[PDB]
Amino acid sequence: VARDITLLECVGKGRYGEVWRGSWQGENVAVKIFSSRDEKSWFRETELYNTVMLRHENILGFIASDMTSRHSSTQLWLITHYHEMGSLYDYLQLTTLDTVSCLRIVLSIASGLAHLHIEIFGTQGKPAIAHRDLKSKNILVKKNGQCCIADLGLAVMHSQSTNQLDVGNNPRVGTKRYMAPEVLDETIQVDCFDSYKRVDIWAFGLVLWEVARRMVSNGIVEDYKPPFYDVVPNDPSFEDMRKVVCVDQQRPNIPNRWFSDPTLTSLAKLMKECWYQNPSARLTALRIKKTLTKID
Numbered sequence: 001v002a003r004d005i006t007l008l009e010c011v012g013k014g015r016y017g018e019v020w021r022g023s024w025q026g027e028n029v030a031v032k033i034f035s036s037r038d039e040k041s042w043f044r045e046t047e048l049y050n051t052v053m054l055r056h057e058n059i060l061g062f063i064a065s066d067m068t069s070r071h072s073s074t075q076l077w078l079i080t081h082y083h084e085m086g087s088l089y090d091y092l093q094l095t096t097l098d099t100v101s102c103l104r105i106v107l108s109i110a111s112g113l114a115h116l117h118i119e120i121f122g123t124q125g126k127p128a129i130a131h132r133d134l135k136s137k138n139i140l141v142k143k144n145g146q147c148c149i150a151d152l153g154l155a156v157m158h159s160q161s162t163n164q165l166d167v168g169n170n171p172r173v174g175t176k177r178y179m180a181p182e183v184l185d186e187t188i189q190v191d192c193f194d195s196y197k198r199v200d201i202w203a204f205g206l207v208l209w210e211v212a213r214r215m216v217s218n219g220i221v222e223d224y225k226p227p228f229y230d231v232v233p234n235d236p237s238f239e240d241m242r243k244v245v246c247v248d249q250q251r252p253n254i255p256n257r258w259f260s261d262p263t264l265t266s267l268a269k270l271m272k273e274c275w276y277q278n279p280s281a282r283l284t285a286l287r288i289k290k291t292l293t294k295i296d
């Protein structure tokens with residue numbers, strides 16, 4: 001369907017590739033043109049969307065995958081629904097949030113993640129899936145104020161019928177800034193699917209912190225900052241992150257003003273339960289979803 005796509009506007013270009021707003025059948029779509037170095041992400045993401053029933057309000061809706069020719073060279077395209085509001089990362093820098101808006105955002109992420117993490121059997125079945133690169137840049141904002149999780153190019157799958165764990169063959173690794181300590185110290189047990197879910201939870205806790213900083217209380221708010229903004233530079237290294245997270249065992253600071261708001265009080269408690277150095281102690285996505293349903 002790439003041949004019937006007119007690229008209307010490029011919204012991003014980087015080492016990974018380009019993302020375009022396009023029209024297909026006169027409708028808005030998002031087009032990712034992968035870079036040459038990332039074909040295995042195109043393969044894995046295409047594989048996930050074509051072999052698993054992934055329809056969910058909080059998971060980015062897949063439309064099609066294709067190979068096409070431009071500049072006498074092969075381009076790999078992935079096409080998805082288009083979300084006018086863009087990434088949560090960009091959204092948080094353009095606006096502040098009230099209590100309803102903040103909770104709607106984080107609950108929607110928890111619901112998407114819990115849907116990924118659980119295996120469903122029968123007609124609506126899906127294997128359990130871990131994401132492995134959760135971050136606010138990989139979350140889109142919808143018009144109704146909920147979010148949807150995007151990018152399954154690093155996803156790992158597990159199915160109970162076979163007890164089969166399907167890791168990729170993708171040499172891509174997660175975003176370093178969001179890597180849990182067991183990833184940075186390379187002690188993660190790679191043959192146990194729960195390890196990957198617990199890595200997602202660590203990253204979700206960081207996203208929770210990013211979003212809650214932008215919720216207004218007592219007429220004040222924090223500026224947007226990425227996690228560990230104060231202790232690592234942009235494009236942090238493996239050594240940078242490992243020293244902060246593994247040795248010094250640092251966690252994002254809770255701003256004092258959160259404790260004069262009941263909602264940010266509970267969110268601070270929640271995000272800390274995702275950041276335990278011991279991975280088995282972290283909350284599950286279902287437990288996080290349940291709790292976020294109870295806040296307010």
Ligand SMILES: COc1cc(-c2cn(C)c(=O)c3cnccc23)c(OC)cc1CN(C)C
Pocket residue numbers: 011012019030031032045060078079080081082083084085086087137138139140150151152153
């Ligand atoms: C099109 O494929 C994707 C598009 C986007 C995407 C990015 N930006 C910046 C957007 O504004 C946007 C707006 N609407 C819909 C989607 C996007 C994405 O989020 C990072 C993940 C994939 C999936 N895959 C290539 C990993």
